Design a protein around this ligand. Structure first.
Ligand SMILES: [Zn+2]
Ligand SMILES: [Zn+2]
Ligand SMILES: [Zn+2]
Length: 70
């Protein structure tokens, strides 16, 4: 499936993922896209701070959903 991530510069990046992908997996994809080390990444979805060990599905993150990097 596909989700979007807003960077600290307002840039929108597109990620191909799956419902079971963990937030840690997503941070690795963001690192590849933008070069940001995972430990410097903090993600938010619908006002929820996302934990590395939980999955997109766990957070109700759907197709075409947008996540925020802070
Ligand atoms: Zn798979
Ligand atoms: Zn995956
Ligand atoms: Zn926003």
């Amino acid at each position: 499936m596909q989700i979007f991530v807003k960077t600290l510069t307002g840039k929108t990046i597109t990620l191909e993922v799956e419902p079971s992908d963990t937030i840690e997996n997503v941070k690795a994809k963001i690192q590849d896209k933008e070069g940001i080390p995972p430990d410097q990444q903090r993600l938010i979805f619908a006002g929820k701070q996302l934990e590395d060990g939980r999955t997109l599905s766990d957070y109700n993150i759907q197709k075409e959903s947008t996540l925020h990097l802070v």
